Write the structure tokens for this entry.
Amino acid sequence: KPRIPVVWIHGLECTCCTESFIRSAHPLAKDVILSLISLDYDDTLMAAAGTQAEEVFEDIITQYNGKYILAVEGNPPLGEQGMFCISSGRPFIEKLKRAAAGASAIIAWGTCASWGCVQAARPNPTQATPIDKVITDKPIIKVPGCPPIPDVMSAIITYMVTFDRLPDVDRMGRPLMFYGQRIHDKCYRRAHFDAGEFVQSWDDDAARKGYCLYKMGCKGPTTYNACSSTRWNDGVSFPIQSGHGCLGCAENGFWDRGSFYSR
Amino acid sequence: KPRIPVVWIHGLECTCCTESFIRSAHPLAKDVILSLISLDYDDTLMAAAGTQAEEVFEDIITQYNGKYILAVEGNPPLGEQGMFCISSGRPFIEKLKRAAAGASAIIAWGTCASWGCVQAARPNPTQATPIDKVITDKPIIKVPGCPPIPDVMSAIITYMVTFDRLPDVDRMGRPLMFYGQRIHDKCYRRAHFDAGEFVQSWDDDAARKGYCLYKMGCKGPTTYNACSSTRWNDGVSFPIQSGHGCLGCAENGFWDRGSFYSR
Amino acid sequence: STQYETQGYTINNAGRRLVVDPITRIEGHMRCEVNINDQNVITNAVSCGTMFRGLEIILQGRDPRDAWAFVERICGVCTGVHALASVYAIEDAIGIKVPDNANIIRNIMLATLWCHDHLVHFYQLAGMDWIDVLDALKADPRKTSELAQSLSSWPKSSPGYFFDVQNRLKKFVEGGQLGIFRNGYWGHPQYKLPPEANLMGFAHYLEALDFQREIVKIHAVFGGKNPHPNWIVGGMPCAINIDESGAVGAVNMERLNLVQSIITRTADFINNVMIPDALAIGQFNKPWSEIGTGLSDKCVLSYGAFPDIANDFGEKSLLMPGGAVINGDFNNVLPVDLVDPQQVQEFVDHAWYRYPNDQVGRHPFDGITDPWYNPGDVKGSDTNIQQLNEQERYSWIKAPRWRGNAMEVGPLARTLIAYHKGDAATVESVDRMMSALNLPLSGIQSTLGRILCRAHEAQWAAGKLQYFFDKLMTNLKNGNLATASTEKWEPATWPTECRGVGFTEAPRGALGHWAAIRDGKIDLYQCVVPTTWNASPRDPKGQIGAYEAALMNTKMAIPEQPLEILRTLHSFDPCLACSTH
Amino acid sequence: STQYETQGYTINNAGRRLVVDPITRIEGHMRCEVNINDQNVITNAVSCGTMFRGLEIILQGRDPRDAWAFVERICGVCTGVHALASVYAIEDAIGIKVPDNANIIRNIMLATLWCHDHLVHFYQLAGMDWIDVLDALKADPRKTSELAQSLSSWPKSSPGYFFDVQNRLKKFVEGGQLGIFRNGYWGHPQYKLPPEANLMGFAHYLEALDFQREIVKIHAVFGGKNPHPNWIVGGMPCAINIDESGAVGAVNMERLNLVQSIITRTADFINNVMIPDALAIGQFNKPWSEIGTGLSDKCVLSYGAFPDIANDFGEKSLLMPGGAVINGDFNNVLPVDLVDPQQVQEFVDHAWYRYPNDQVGRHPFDGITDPWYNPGDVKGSDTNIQQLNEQERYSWIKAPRWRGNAMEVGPLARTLIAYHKGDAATVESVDRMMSALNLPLSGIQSTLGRILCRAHEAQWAAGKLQYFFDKLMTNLKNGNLATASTEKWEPATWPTECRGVGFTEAPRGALGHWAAIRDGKIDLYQCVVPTTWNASPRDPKGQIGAYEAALMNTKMAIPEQPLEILRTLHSFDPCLACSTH
Ligand code: SF4
Ligand code: SF4
Ligand code: FCO
Ligand code: FCO
Ligand code: SF3
Ligand code: SF3
Ligand code: F3S
Ligand code: F3S
Ligand SMILES: [Cl-]
Ligand SMILES: [Cl-]
Ligand SMILES: [Cl-]
Ligand SMILES: [Cl-]
Ligand SMILES: [Mg+2]
Ligand SMILES: [Mg+2]
Ligand code: NI
Ligand code: NI
């Protein structure tokens, strides 16, 4: 049977969302690409460059008008007439709008496309702007995190292909399945939090026993993500399990909510 | 250079401890066997049977007298003159004592060898008896659980070979590294416990949200093990994560502490 | 010495007595004794379970809802199957129907076990009876590659790979620490593989040891852990949440993805490693298609398993057929009823138990487990057995019979039953497999046949895994998430007095749990387990069980080296903890 | 049109103009323009970073302890390397020494990144420039097996395997949904692999895509997650507990076991898949040992990396040598000092930034990041560039120089530096590698050479992984567990005013972070990143950077199909997000 067309574009970004995607353990990114979707455009992985790449882009969005999913990594800058991010000699934002116009739905990968992420942190030199502030007439699924969990990314994809619909979302457009609860609502150190058992300086006795990282600045209490349950890299770890507090990296504006090491 | 000789014997058992050992993800049981130890006797895996197996047993405990580690799975029954478990036409307990006498140290695998496990539950028809009540003049490391976690078993082995010493133990002879804390001290559902958010009947809304299993009988609060941190089967799950309360399976007499579904 | 005739055999205990105690590369504890004549042919075979724990006693007075957890620890090898039989039995007693997804997940747990158990048995338990491990040191790596590549599409076949495996084995043995290979039967004339096939098989032994750990991840997802996953009366505790808040606390799309990944790799390993190895062993050991027939051409039994219609245990539902054949009449597959007191019975005249009348058999609803260690007139003493006395009590295993008939259970039994009831997939698979070996159908009724059917079943179960997963996903797509029925969870809702039967097909054969509930507590709990059948001692008519029959009439090249005995016994996959419970 | 001479090149912008925008199979956003003469030879090359975010601006006013987390997001491909440079820089400023285990773990994090980044670059980014994926459909599976087995002991080589891979690709393309292969350069005359080597390479592409995910589990253990692991100023937060209560809450023996398992498999994959594939590409593409030399025979730079003596960044400590060569004088490897205002400077006369005087270069401690989009007289408009004007400002990338010299950085640079400082392992390795291809040493100074050195480095780093792990375990055996120094964690302990430099060798080359702290906050933070060097625009003397130089003088078979340009650019592993930050 035909596989669902996906167009994956890139604005201002670090490429952490593409890298996360290819870490998928189940399904493997290999099998996603070969069997689950048609990844028809993707700057980081595709053979075609330059005019060949433009031809793929134009052909796909024309031929599958109204039928492709648009995945967006990174975000459009509004500064300098959009020429802080240039694609084919024009503002990235023009490519975003053209791609958005033909999509059935959009996936905003990561805190970049969802919220703004690091380039939108004070003082936001480029006027980096999240996708939903620019595209206002399309379903946008926000999949935040810097980056999101690999197996969350692949799970959302498999959900859309298997069930042939978008995940249900909270009021902010995040899939309930993985963003419905807080890190702190499923954190294996909560026993210590409840007991007032806290790491107070790095590598103290409390740290060597896996005590709670709240006094070290953990932002788990205000952060919605699946890290403390699903975990990272095939269930191997997550920030808190490896001894560092949650930064808040799935939440809007997390860079500017004060030092990572303060309350 | 020579690998450390290990003699692995079996009393009354279900073989869950051998099966757990071979599930090891890192190191693989294969590499443990080929490279880390010399598994010189083991009924479940060894080529030799009958008189050939007796010859291996006698040769190993003679040639490496004072130099081998004895691993014990299962336990001796004292009933019917010990002939509830017969090896080479004699009571298993005689084989246990002979093996113990030449060992440098003993590992009591599982709740069977550590405490008694299911055959020692009321009314203990066979007078199944844990190893430390029979062998009283040797270092015994208790590694309880029914069975213990695969990667805990392999970790204890790698510790002994790498560091050339026994793990430090609590007052019950359990390695501090993995049995120093309770399931409930590192359970990812503690947030729910602390908030009074409990499953009340199977597959209710609370269950579908991963609420705490205390009211369904979970014995995590009184059970020392690594299941809620290290988890099972290469970090894939543990009892509570898959929706069933802890049975208490690492604790002495857990079968006779009342219904698994009561407090 | 005495001689009598039973089931076409002449049981004669004159001549040299051989003892194999312990039997290794089985689960649990077994003793085997034979007599051989001057031609080194077995004229008498004695099967003795050398352990007992007493789960049926321990279960009395417990909560029925807790039963599954106790009986699961009957066995860590067939881990889960007793839990399944238990929840089936309690549900049957109380009158509980589980939701479809619970049923499907249970079928997944059982299919996972079949795959895992059959695979590990083939390589780690039986394999060294067929593969001469030390002979692999003589193989040519390139010829090994060429052989492997002629048999299979499996990627891992390079000369350098076989050289590395060979070098690993060489370094292992070079210090004289041979471990599990020490004092084996290497070089015995019944080892018939060329060195290249020994190196191919040994490589696969190591690959299987690695890979098996992955299969049970399906058990970890739905059941928390392996060994010894968790279950509930009323369904399964692994609540499902696909598309709602808190899915991180349940079986969600990422968890199901993990399960799918394991299913695919499991099928691939079985189909491309185990299946071709099973056929290769067949190819080099065709005489063993005529050794160890035992009861397999006379009497075979299946209860059936894998109900595809939730809560329906009838013929139209069970994907693995049930039925009984007696008297070598494979044209009359007979229906089995586990409530009928005239069908399944256990005798203890030759076992270490007390009955009011040891000359009759008791249906498990009338079962009694009153241990009585009484070996009578042994050579030696009651704490130092040199020779069991098989004219008296000689085992911790009860003697089950079906309508008074001694039956074989397990993969070969099931295959025969399914074949002769006309199951299309079974017929096609068996015909293909026997065609490939240029052997008649009858070649399957043998020690070699038991191993071939076990491989067939691993492939069958891997295919069924995908089928069940697909059915689960179909339900989820339709908004059907339920995993538990709790309307009758509370004791107050149960009948004051009720009884039930839970049955399935464990890896080793037909499994039944018979439970009686009274006043909220277990009144009686009786287990009849596959190895109880196969390893059975004799009955009041002197009839022999499947192990004793299969060992009868067997040639031994070297009496002091019991390779032929090990081959036949191992081919049944003995689980002695199961047998005795 | 104009012509001038620089660094032995004749820069001539007469003739046909070619534009490649976007450059794909890189990290981030790049535009390349060339002019070709009547022989289709490149006479002008223009390197343009088409993105900017402004991390150096964002970092002002932040806590120094938080800096690593912001700058890590300069790049998700070389994820971690900026965090490392950051903690190095802050520690250097404040005067912090970390415990040995922190240093070792940091070295492990960097070595892990080298292995991962080099591997994925080789297959997923550069690979399809050398492997004709569609031509793999023509390969013979058996010949493929034979080729693979002649090159490597890697297990996965069976004809059936190559057939299955080929059939997968066949079914993928059959329906016309070619995905990442759509509208590629397949069939271009510069594709020189035989079909069997294309199928071998494509199979390895898929194997590498799978396997790369495993390497970063090391980052997950010590750093919580990948991409973008966590770090601290003062060491690492992954506290160690081996033999005490609560080891479940720390890096314990089971966690270290996982790490060891990943190291072994990583080394095995690199040594037996990537290394032979790199040599095979060399074998079939020997002319590319003479294409794309650029600055690699004139000017190369390494800062050095992997300090083996904790807190010592000197020559005797760094396992990866630092040094500079200028003017093609490889007999005089020069010392590098990152504090010397006369050494590292950045120019912006040809970049979209404001300086008080754009005719001078600023050392990063005097650096300025004041964005100024001013493309001047382009063909088109400010929002529709048809042709950059390389006589004025044409990039978001600053132009770094070392003592006024345009330098190449990265694996080839490091290899040349180590080689010519007389590092025994490097000399032996390079000599053997060039010997095997029957090429002179000079063949390494090339597009093909950059790819060969990258493979060499992946092998080197995999070896170093084990070395560092062994050093960690040695400390743990001696009871040395410390992972963090917190004496100067609190701002109140810091100098009111201080500054520092953190430097390392990222996968793509020499990396420096220059940080100035005042009153507990970042006063200035300036980054000069490897691709900033390599993708550099021109300076006031018109000198060209590594990309422009390497593209110069290159023949194109088909102007409209820029395969030669992609090959040379990809050989440097461009990271444009890094370049611009
Ligand atoms: S470590 Fe963070 S998320 Fe976990 S219990 Fe403490 S504050 Fe909450
Ligand atoms: S599920 Fe059990 S161990 Fe976890 S918080 Fe609740 S009672 Fe404690
Ligand atoms: N299979 C299995 Fe175990 C036995 N015999 C059970 O039931
Ligand atoms: N490697 C890498 Fe990224 C670049 N260029 C850095 O530093
Ligand atoms: Fe994930 S591209 Fe990396 S920065 Fe934070 S999401 Fe963006
Ligand atoms: Fe683990 S052999 Fe299985 S019963 Fe509980 S430990 Fe015993
Ligand atoms: S930092 Fe991000 S990765 Fe998870 S634990 Fe916190 S939301
Ligand atoms: S039942 Fe046992 S396996 Fe762990 S979660 Fe409880 S100690
Ligand atoms: Cl794009
Ligand atoms: Cl944000
Ligand atoms: Cl034993
Ligand atoms: Cl106990
Ligand atoms: Mg029974
Ligand atoms: Mg800079
Ligand atoms: Ni069993
Ligand atoms: Ni980068």
